[PDB]
């Protein structure tokens, strides 16, 4: 009868940002939000490490994405469709652009949404130096 872990313990982690290709990096981050690397993987409990990104205001991206890529956003009202381009995201709220990716790479349910909360993105760094912080790459 297959193994089932007990109350784990939140391993935290610290990722850079500069020079990282937006999507490429976003993948790794997600796989960390879920277990998938921890061999006691359990798809119904959430125990993926806490992730903390910093200097997100520096993310690389190929092509002409800075002008090409535009983020849509619907409000309930007529014509409520907004078209914000990448250039403007970073120009304004830049931690935002990293979120719109990883979130879009997490599962859909109630647990998936919990996982998003385990992500902390900054443009800095200078993040709140709580405790653990094992920088990675």
């Amino acid at each position: 009868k297959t193994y089932v872990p007990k109350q784990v313990e939140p391993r935290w982690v610290l990722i850079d940002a500069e020079g990282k290709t937006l999507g490429r990096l976003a993948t790794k981050i997600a796989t960390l939000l879920r277990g998938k690397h921890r061999p006691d993987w359990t798809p119904n409990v959430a125990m993926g490490d806490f992730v903390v990104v910093v200097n997100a205001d520096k993310i690389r991206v190929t092509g002409k994405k800075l002008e090409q890529k535009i983020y849509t956003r619907y409000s309930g009202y007529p014509g409520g469709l907004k078209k914000i381009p990448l250039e403007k995201m970073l120009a304004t709220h830049p931690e935002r652009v990293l979120e719109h990716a990883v979130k879009g790479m997490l599962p859909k349910g109630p647990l998936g949404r919990r996982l998003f909360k385990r992500l902390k993105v900054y443009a800095g760094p200078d993040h709140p130096h709580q405790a653990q912080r094992p920088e990675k790459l």
Partner: peptide, 10 residues
Amino acid sequence: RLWIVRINAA
């Protein structure tokens, strides 16, 4: 599946 992940994991 579950096993494969857990395996590939460690």
